[PDB]
Structures are given as structure tokens and as C-alpha cells.
């Protein structure tokens, strides 16, 4: 998964973070 990474939560903030 990508939503389990702080950096991936930056580019995907409200959808993935």
C-alpha cells in the first residue's frame, strides 16, 4: 500500500492521508 507512507500522504493528503 502507498497510504502507509508519510511521503505518499503528502501528494495524496485527504484521499490517502
Ordered DSSP codes for the chain: --TTSTTHHHHSSTTT-
Element (H, E) at 11: helix 8-11
Q: What experimental approach yielded this model?
A: NMR
Q: Determine contact, residues 3/17, Cβ cutoff 8 Å.
A: yes
User: Distance (Å, rounded) from C-alpha 11 to C-alpha 3?
Assistant: 10
Q: Of 3, 1, 2, nearest to 17 (Cα)?
A: 3
Q: Determine contact, residues 11/5, Cβ cutoff 8 Å.
A: no
User: Distance (Å, rounded) from C-alpha 5 to C-alpha 12?
Assistant: 10
Give Rg (Cα) of the chain. Answer: 6
User: Distance (Å, rounded) from C-alpha 9 to C-alpha 12?
Assistant: 5
Cell of 12: 495524496
Cα dihedral 7, 8, 9, 10 sign: positive
Amino acid at each position: 500500500g502507498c497510504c502507509s507512507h508519510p511521503a505518499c500522504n503528502v501528494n495524496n493528503p485527504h484521499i490517502c492521508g
